[PDB]
Design a protein around this ligand. Structure first.
Ligand SMILES: CC/C=C\C/C=C\C/C=C\C/C=C\C/C=C\C/C=C\CCC(=O)O
Length: 131
């Protein structure tokens, strides 16, 4: 987890538009999700782990304890029951709403943070570089 503690900037993403289409996110929000390069701040603040995503179209922010379910209102406005946890060396984020489930895997790869987002059989990848 200390490995993920830093300010990160999106440097590249692939197939993110289709992943969003699957999630059922509206046209107005995907346009925004396609041209924005968010700054993701991950840190440990006291007892919890905080994940802040800064964008000029939306500023989110989810604080939690590993292994503990919590409520989350996503950028595309889906109220989910989420859980963030460590699986060996990867940070796994799982979101559950309307009988559905999508998950994000964040892992450190050759200097960078690789984020794999998957929904059913649809996969999207995002690369992050430290500030
Ligand atoms: C629960 C946190 C949700 C969203 C964070 C806020 C803004 C993200 C940017 C644009 C909104 C577009 C789509 C919302 C759906 C999924 C967002 C997935 C990952 C966040 C991107 C990242 O890690 O920088």
């Amino acid at each position: 987890v200390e490995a993920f503690c830093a300010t990160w900037k999106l440097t590249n993403s692939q197939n993110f538009d289709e992943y969003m289409k699957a999630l059922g996110v509206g046209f107005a929000t995907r346009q925004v999700g396609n041209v924005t390069k968010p700054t993701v701040i991950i840190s440990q603040e006291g007892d919890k782990v905080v994940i802040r995503t800064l964008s000029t179209f939306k500023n989110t922010e989810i604080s939690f304890q590993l292994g503990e379910e919590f409520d989350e209102t996503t950028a595309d406005d889906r109220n989910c029951k989420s859980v963030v946890s460590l699986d060996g060396d990867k940070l796994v984020h799982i979101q559950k709403w309307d009988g559905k489930e999508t998950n994000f895997v964040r892992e450190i790869k050759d200097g960078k943070m690789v984020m794999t987002l998957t929904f059913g059989d649809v996969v999207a990848v995002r690369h992050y570089e430290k500030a």
